[PDB]
Amino acid sequence: NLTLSDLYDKDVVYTSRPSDEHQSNFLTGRELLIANQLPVIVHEASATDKLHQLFQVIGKEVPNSIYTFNNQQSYENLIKQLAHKENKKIYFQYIHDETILNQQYYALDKTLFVALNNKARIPEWTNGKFLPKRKVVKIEQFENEIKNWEFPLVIKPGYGVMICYHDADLQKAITRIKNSLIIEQKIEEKANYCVQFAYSESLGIQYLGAATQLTDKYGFYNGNENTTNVPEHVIEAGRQIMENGVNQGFFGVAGFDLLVDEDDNVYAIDLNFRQNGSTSMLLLANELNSGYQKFYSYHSKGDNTHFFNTILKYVKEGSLYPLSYYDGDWYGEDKVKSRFGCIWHGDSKETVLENERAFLAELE
Ligand SMILES: Nc1ncnc2c1ncn2[C@@H]1O[C@H](COP(=O)(O)OP(=O)(O)O)[C@@H](O)[C@H]1O
Numbered sequence: 427n428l429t430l431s432d433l434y435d436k437d438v439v440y441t442s443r444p445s446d447e448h449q450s451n452f453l454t455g456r457e458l459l460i461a462n463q464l465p466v467i468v469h470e471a472s473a474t475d476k477l478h479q480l481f482q483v484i485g486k487e488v489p490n491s492i493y494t495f496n497n498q499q500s501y502e503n504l505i506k507q508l509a510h511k512e513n514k515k516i517y518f519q520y521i522h523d524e525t526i527l528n529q530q531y532y533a534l535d536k537t538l539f540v541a542l543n544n545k546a547r548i549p550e551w552t553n554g555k556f557l558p559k560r561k562v563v564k565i566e567q568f569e570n571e572i573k574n575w576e577f578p579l580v581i582k583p584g585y586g587v588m589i590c591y592h593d594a595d596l597q598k599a600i601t602r603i604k605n606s607l608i609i610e611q612k613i614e615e616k617a618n619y620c621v622q623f624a625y626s627e628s629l630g631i632q633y634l635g636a637a638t639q640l641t642d643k644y645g646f647y648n649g650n651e652n653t654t655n656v657p658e659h660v661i662e663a664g665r666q667i668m669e670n671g672v673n674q675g676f677f678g679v680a681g682f683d684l685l686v687d688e689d690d691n692v693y694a695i696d697l698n699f700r701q702n703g704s705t706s707m708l709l710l711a712n713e714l715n716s717g718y719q720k721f722y723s724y725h726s727k728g729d730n731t732h733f734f735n736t737i738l739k740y741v742k743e744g745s746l747y748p749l750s751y752y753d754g755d756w757y758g759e760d761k762v763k764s765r766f767g768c769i770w771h772g773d774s775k776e777t778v779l780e781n782e783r784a785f786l787a788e789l790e
């Protein structure tokens with residue numbers, strides 16, 4: 427299976443940190459087990475002895491090719507040092523301000539990265555295909571325009587995504603809104619997929635697989651599950667979107683949130699020209715039970731020692747594959763909440779989800 431160094435040239439250094447600072451630090455370790463030879467910028471608390479212990483159980487090692495930082499200033503100074511004095515190109519997962527690093531030191535064209543990930547611009551990347559009823563509306567005209575829409579509908583920035591089923595939901599959304607907004611019909615989906623692809627010049631476009639997104643009825647993220655039953659026309663919709671981005675210079679990993687309705691129509695509701703936590707579930711498939719897999723993340727309830735030791739219990743049982751660990755005790759005992767990203771895997775959904783619930787009960 428592919429690793430990230432297969433996609434990125436030797437001069438690239440990778441950061442998955444968003445520009446909650448502790449949650450952002452926790453994300454720096456997200457890709458460590460798939461990075462291989464790619465150097466990764468990681469918070470010190472994301473690679474303590476606790477991470478080494480978890481990886482050791484499953485026969486993995488922490489990459490030696492990490493650069494660490496411990497606060498905002500050290501993060502920003504490290505980026506400048508690598509680009510200005512070590513001839514590195516920085517591959518970002520999230521938009522960073524120009525004061526941090528001028529565009530000429532980006533591994534991937536910043537203007538293209540912003541355009542590919544701009545939700546208002548989805549129709550450009552699908553060539554007008556795969557769209558629900560959807561309009562981009564300036565905020566001053568929004569309240570009057572929204573009266574023309576039937577429920578259920580979705581409001582997105584052009585607060586986060588606001589799914590509205592009725593007038594009460596809409597009035598709450600309007601209060602939170604008070605330059606542009608996306609209004610979209612809420613599709614009554616029978617399936618969703620996050621379909622993922624990689625590209626490099628030597629490899630061409632490669633389909634990596636797909637994960638289902640677990641979301642509540644308001645779209646809030648509750649994890650990702652494995653799936654091998656992706657319809658060919660869903661894969662092809664994703665491949666077309668990938669090719670559109672690649673043709674303008676995209677390289678690396680991308681994932682597309684594709685919904686399918688009861689008539690098998692495909693809707694592209696979110697394009698992520700960047701990777702996510704579930705990319706690791708696809709690329710580590712050789713080490714996971716294929717029966718059922720669920721990727722998610724968890725926070726300490728307070729006692730970081732009990733959090734870690736409960737995690738270690740389940741890792742040693744073999745049900746729980748550790749991906750990332752932010753050690754809040756790096757700041758002092760229980761001063762900051764530890765955080766953990768992982769894959770539950772096993773023979774069936776029933777047994778795996780029972781293990782997850784047992785773990786959550788043991789924590790609380
Ligand atoms: N038009 C839509 N129809 C149905 N569900 C939607 C729609 N837009 C968003 N959702 C739901 O909300 C979730 C989050 O929306 P998304 O646009 O993917 O935002 P994010 O950028 O936070 O991923 C989706 O995964 C899906 O479950």
Ligand SMILES: [Cl-]
Pocket residue numbers: 540541544
């Ligand atoms: Cl843009």
Ligand SMILES: [Mg+2]
Pocket residue numbers: 683696
């Ligand atoms: Mg999404």
Ligand code: NA
Pocket residue numbers: 543545696697698699
């Ligand atoms: Na996106």
